[PDB]
Amino acid sequence: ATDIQMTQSPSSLSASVGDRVTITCQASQDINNYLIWYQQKPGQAPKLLIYDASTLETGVPSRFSGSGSGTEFTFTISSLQPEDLATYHCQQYDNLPYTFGQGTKLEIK
Amino acid sequence: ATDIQMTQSPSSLSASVGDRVTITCQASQDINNYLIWYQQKPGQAPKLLIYDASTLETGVPSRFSGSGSGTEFTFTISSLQPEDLATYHCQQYDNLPYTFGQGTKLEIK
């Protein structure tokens, strides 16, 4: 494919409450600044958390943060709360088709 | 797998130059009018054709059109030209993750 491949690392991860957790996302091609991070908990609507790589959405805790441009992006949770148990997916929207990562499954204990 | 499944039919097709061609896209859930059609030729970047189900993007041949709302969408080439040999894909952007169809590969007979 000339399709942009979004790959996330780690794919799975356990941490404890209070931990800073950082996960990563990699675009196979340059997607400039056009990257979403969303949170899927099971049977449930994805919550758009970051857009344009670095921009928090409204009513989104300041403990979440994205950064990066080009091909390397990063999602930090600065201090982990339990309501953070979620698969975190990345999604590019720079170039069709709009591909997304297989997720980082963030579990606890 | 509560992701929106985008389904296309036919998956390929051969038609003659001058023919009217109509291809369909089905969403597994209602996605309003938040549907793109795009064209993929091998080697080349995808070219957005239609957005919001029916709005034709600037510089796109007028013989292309889109219709439908909700779950059943349709794309039409009013009169087939040889350079329309490509695969035509639909893409939803109503809900994360933004999922897309495996395409209709159109050949010229």
From TrEMBL, chains A, B:
Coiled coil: none annotated. CDD domains: IgV_L_kappa. It holds the Pfam family V-set. InterPro entries: Ig-like_dom, Ig-like_dom_sf, Ig-like_fold, Ig_sub, Ig_V-set, IgV_Light_Chain. Disulfide bonds join C25-C90. Residues 4-91 form the Ig-like domain. It is found in: Cell membrane; Secreted. Keywords: Adaptive immunity, Cell membrane, Immunity, Immunoglobulin, Immunoglobulin domain, Membrane, Secreted. GO terms for cellular component: extracellular region; immunoglobulin complex; plasma membrane. One of its GO terms (biological process) is adaptive immune response. PANTHER family: IMMUNOGLOBULIN LIGHT CHAIN. This is BRE.
